[PDB]
PDB file as gemmi writes it, atoms N, CA and C in Angstrom:
CRYST1    1.000    1.000    1.000  90.00  90.00  90.00 P 1                      
ATOM      1  N   UNK A   1      -5.344   3.993  -2.959  1.00  0.00           N  
ATOM      2  CA  UNK A   1      -6.606   5.232  -2.229  1.00  0.00           C  
ATOM      3  C   UNK A   1      -7.668   5.883  -1.931  1.00  0.00           C  
ATOM      4  N   UNK A   2      -6.698   6.917  -3.386  1.00  0.00           N  
ATOM      5  CA  UNK A   2      -8.189   8.178  -2.665  1.00  0.00           C  
ATOM      6  C   UNK A   2      -8.536   7.695  -4.499  1.00  0.00           C  
ATOM      7  N   UNK A   3      -9.933   7.876  -4.604  1.00  0.00           N  
ATOM      8  CA  UNK A   3     -10.916   7.202  -6.011  1.00  0.00           C  
ATOM      9  C   UNK A   3     -11.364   7.757  -6.708  1.00  0.00           C  
ATOM     10  N   UNK A   4     -10.297   9.794  -6.562  1.00  0.00           N  
ATOM     11  CA  UNK A   4      -9.890   9.474  -8.030  1.00  0.00           C  
ATOM     12  C   UNK A   4      -9.407   8.322  -8.706  1.00  0.00           C  
ATOM     13  N   UNK A   5      -8.834   7.857  -8.591  1.00  0.00           N  
ATOM     14  CA  UNK A   5      -7.931   6.911  -9.464  1.00  0.00           C  
ATOM     15  C   UNK A   5      -9.133   5.636  -9.620  1.00  0.00           C  
ATOM     16  N   UNK A   6      -9.421   5.743 -11.219  1.00  0.00           N  
ATOM     17  CA  UNK A   6     -10.714   4.916 -10.923  1.00  0.00           C  
ATOM     18  C   UNK A   6     -10.486   3.518 -11.711  1.00  0.00           C  
ATOM     19  N   UNK A   7      -9.787   2.585 -10.531  1.00  0.00           N  
ATOM     20  CA  UNK A   7      -8.797   1.793 -10.099  1.00  0.00           C  
ATOM     21  C   UNK A   7      -8.985   1.362  -8.387  1.00  0.00           C  
ATOM     22  N   UNK A   8      -8.497   0.067  -7.796  1.00  0.00           N  
ATOM     23  CA  UNK A   8      -7.786   0.171  -6.755  1.00  0.00           C  
ATOM     24  C   UNK A   8      -6.334  -1.031  -7.011  1.00  0.00           C  
ATOM     25  N   UNK A   9      -5.703  -0.932  -5.632  1.00  0.00           N  
ATOM     26  CA  UNK A   9      -4.763  -1.274  -5.556  1.00  0.00           C  
ATOM     27  C   UNK A   9      -4.688  -2.155  -4.795  1.00  0.00           C  
ATOM     28  N   UNK A  10      -3.754  -3.028  -4.633  1.00  0.00           N  
ATOM     29  CA  UNK A  10      -2.819  -4.101  -3.943  1.00  0.00           C  
ATOM     30  C   UNK A  10      -2.487  -3.976  -2.806  1.00  0.00           C  
ATOM     31  N   UNK A  11      -1.694  -4.940  -2.125  1.00  0.00           N  
ATOM     32  CA  UNK A  11      -1.723  -4.646  -0.894  1.00  0.00           C  
ATOM     33  C   UNK A  11      -0.562  -4.337  -1.144  1.00  0.00           C  
ATOM     34  N   UNK A  12       0.653  -4.701  -1.359  1.00  0.00           N  
ATOM     35  CA  UNK A  12       2.320  -4.254  -1.901  1.00  0.00           C  
ATOM     36  C   UNK A  12       1.799  -2.732  -2.934  1.00  0.00           C  
ATOM     37  N   UNK A  13       1.210  -3.233  -3.649  1.00  0.00           N  
ATOM     38  CA  UNK A  13       1.324  -1.546  -4.814  1.00  0.00           C  
ATOM     39  C   UNK A  13       0.927  -0.342  -3.387  1.00  0.00           C  
ATOM     40  N   UNK A  14      -0.284  -1.129  -2.192  1.00  0.00           N  
ATOM     41  CA  UNK A  14      -0.174   0.543  -1.599  1.00  0.00           C  
ATOM     42  C   UNK A  14       0.841   0.313  -0.261  1.00  0.00           C  
ATOM     43  N   UNK A  15       1.531  -0.402  -0.487  1.00  0.00           N  
ATOM     44  CA  UNK A  15       2.993   0.005   0.718  1.00  0.00           C  
ATOM     45  C   UNK A  15       3.813   0.950  -0.143  1.00  0.00           C  
ATOM     46  N   UNK A  16       4.331   0.491  -1.227  1.00  0.00           N  
ATOM     47  CA  UNK A  16       4.825   1.133  -1.729  1.00  0.00           C  
ATOM     48  C   UNK A  16       4.202   2.960  -1.872  1.00  0.00           C  
ATOM     49  N   UNK A  17       2.843   2.576  -2.300  1.00  0.00           N  
ATOM     50  CA  UNK A  17       2.675   4.821  -2.056  1.00  0.00           C  
ATOM     51  C   UNK A  17       2.280   4.543  -0.921  1.00  0.00           C  
ATOM     52  N   UNK A  18       2.256   4.351   0.145  1.00  0.00           N  
ATOM     53  CA  UNK A  18       2.253   4.781   1.687  1.00  0.00           C  
ATOM     54  C   UNK A  18       4.173   5.260   1.799  1.00  0.00           C  
ATOM     55  N   UNK A  19       4.926   4.399   1.635  1.00  0.00           N  
ATOM     56  CA  UNK A  19       6.245   4.624   1.559  1.00  0.00           C  
ATOM     57  C   UNK A  19       6.861   6.239   0.453  1.00  0.00           C  
ATOM     58  N   UNK A  20       5.591   6.125  -0.238  1.00  0.00           N  
ATOM     59  CA  UNK A  20       6.606   7.015  -1.695  1.00  0.00           C  
ATOM     60  C   UNK A  20       5.928   8.501  -0.637  1.00  0.00           C  
ATOM     61  N   UNK A  21       4.260   8.788  -0.142  1.00  0.00           N  
ATOM     62  CA  UNK A  21       3.955   9.110   0.540  1.00  0.00           C  
ATOM     63  C   UNK A  21       4.356   9.943   1.688  1.00  0.00           C  
ATOM     64  N   UNK A  22       5.481   9.210   2.312  1.00  0.00           N  
ATOM     65  CA  UNK A  22       6.064   9.353   3.648  1.00  0.00           C  
ATOM     66  C   UNK A  22       7.131   9.984   3.293  1.00  0.00           C  
ATOM     67  N   UNK A  23       7.943   9.862   1.948  1.00  0.00           N  
ATOM     68  CA  UNK A  23       9.429  10.261   0.731  1.00  0.00           C  
ATOM     69  C   UNK A  23       9.135  11.682   0.889  1.00  0.00           C  
ATOM     70  N   UNK A  24       7.685  11.464   0.475  1.00  0.00           N  
ATOM     71  CA  UNK A  24       7.177  13.410   0.180  1.00  0.00           C  
ATOM     72  C   UNK A  24       6.827  14.071   1.508  1.00  0.00           C  
ATOM     73  N   UNK A  25       6.583  13.425   2.714  1.00  0.00           N  
ATOM     74  CA  UNK A  25       6.313  13.549   3.986  1.00  0.00           C  
ATOM     75  C   UNK A  25       7.435  14.022   4.110  1.00  0.00           C  
ATOM     76  N   UNK A  26       8.964  13.192   4.068  1.00  0.00           N  
ATOM     77  CA  UNK A  26      10.516  13.470   4.539  1.00  0.00           C  
ATOM     78  C   UNK A  26      11.132  14.399   3.597  1.00  0.00           C  
ATOM     79  N   UNK A  27       9.837  15.017   1.942  1.00  0.00           N  
ATOM     80  CA  UNK A  27      11.306  14.943   1.636  1.00  0.00           C  
ATOM     81  C   UNK A  27      12.273  15.025   0.870  1.00  0.00           C  
ATOM     82  N   UNK A  28      12.054  12.944  -0.671  1.00  0.00           N  
ATOM     83  CA  UNK A  28      12.787  12.544  -0.697  1.00  0.00           C  
ATOM     84  C   UNK A  28      12.118  11.681  -2.083  1.00  0.00           C  
ATOM     85  N   UNK A  29      13.176  12.342  -2.272  1.00  0.00           N  
ATOM     86  CA  UNK A  29      12.627  11.853  -3.954  1.00  0.00           C  
ATOM     87  C   UNK A  29      14.284   9.540  -3.570  1.00  0.00           C  
ATOM     88  N   UNK A  30      13.248   8.608  -4.710  1.00  0.00           N  
ATOM     89  CA  UNK A  30      13.736   7.611  -4.132  1.00  0.00           C  
ATOM     90  C   UNK A  30      13.643   6.465  -5.933  1.00  0.00           C  
ATOM     91  N   UNK A  31      13.561   5.410  -5.995  1.00  0.00           N  
ATOM     92  CA  UNK A  31      13.772   4.566  -6.897  1.00  0.00           C  
ATOM     93  C   UNK A  31      12.751   3.281  -6.230  1.00  0.00           C  
ATOM     94  N   UNK A  32      11.998   3.600  -7.746  1.00  0.00           N  
ATOM     95  CA  UNK A  32      11.022   2.598  -7.607  1.00  0.00           C  
ATOM     96  C   UNK A  32      11.430   1.266  -9.066  1.00  0.00           C  
ATOM     97  N   UNK A  33      10.528   0.890  -9.607  1.00  0.00           N  
ATOM     98  CA  UNK A  33      11.199  -0.146 -11.361  1.00  0.00           C  
ATOM     99  C   UNK A  33      11.683  -1.139 -10.413  1.00  0.00           C  
ATOM    100  N   UNK A  34      11.258  -2.189 -10.060  1.00  0.00           N  
ATOM    101  CA  UNK A  34      11.603  -3.809 -10.284  1.00  0.00           C  
ATOM    102  C   UNK A  34      11.807  -5.166 -12.205  1.00  0.00           C  
ATOM    103  N   UNK A  35      10.979  -5.412 -11.883  1.00  0.00           N  
ATOM    104  CA  UNK A  35      10.867  -7.043 -12.735  1.00  0.00           C  
ATOM    105  C   UNK A  35       9.949  -5.728 -13.099  1.00  0.00           C  
ATOM    106  N   UNK A  36       9.906  -5.905 -14.930  1.00  0.00           N  
ATOM    107  CA  UNK A  36       8.535  -5.069 -15.509  1.00  0.00           C  
ATOM    108  C   UNK A  36       7.231  -6.458 -15.072  1.00  0.00           C  
ATOM    109  N   UNK A  37       6.346  -5.380 -15.840  1.00  0.00           N  
ATOM    110  CA  UNK A  37       5.171  -6.384 -15.808  1.00  0.00           C  
ATOM    111  C   UNK A  37       4.259  -6.200 -14.012  1.00  0.00           C  
ATOM    112  N   UNK A  38       3.752  -5.093 -13.744  1.00  0.00           N  
ATOM    113  CA  UNK A  38       3.676  -4.779 -12.333  1.00  0.00           C  
ATOM    114  C   UNK A  38       3.552  -4.825 -11.856  1.00  0.00           C  
ATOM    115  N   UNK A  39       3.027  -2.813 -12.725  1.00  0.00           N  
ATOM    116  CA  UNK A  39       2.369  -2.106 -12.392  1.00  0.00           C  
ATOM    117  C   UNK A  39       2.545  -0.702 -12.134  1.00  0.00           C  
ATOM    118  N   UNK A  40       3.388  -0.304 -12.636  1.00  0.00           N  
ATOM    119  CA  UNK A  40       4.890   0.413 -11.970  1.00  0.00           C  
ATOM    120  C   UNK A  40       3.696   2.116 -12.676  1.00  0.00           C  
ATOM    121  N   UNK A  41       3.132   2.033 -14.307  1.00  0.00           N  
ATOM    122  CA  UNK A  41       2.852   3.467 -14.773  1.00  0.00           C  
ATOM    123  C   UNK A  41       1.516   3.628 -13.184  1.00  0.00           C  
ATOM    124  N   UNK A  42       0.460   2.069 -12.888  1.00  0.00           N  
ATOM    125  CA  UNK A  42      -0.346   2.274 -11.811  1.00  0.00           C  
ATOM    126  C   UNK A  42       0.310   3.394 -10.188  1.00  0.00           C  
ATOM    127  N   UNK A  43       1.156   2.456 -10.090  1.00  0.00           N  
ATOM    128  CA  UNK A  43       2.183   3.240  -8.788  1.00  0.00           C  
ATOM    129  C   UNK A  43       1.416   4.602  -8.703  1.00  0.00           C  
TER     130      UNK A  43                                                      
END                                                                             
C-alpha cells in the first residue's frame, strides 16, 4: 500500500495486509503461511 515498497500488491495481498494492520491496531499477533509460492515474504 505505501510506495516505500518497490512493488504493488494484489487484492488478497492488500486485504491480508489490512487484516494484519487491524491486528496491530488491536495488539494481536497471528498466523499466515498458506500454500507455498504465494508471496508471504512480500506481504
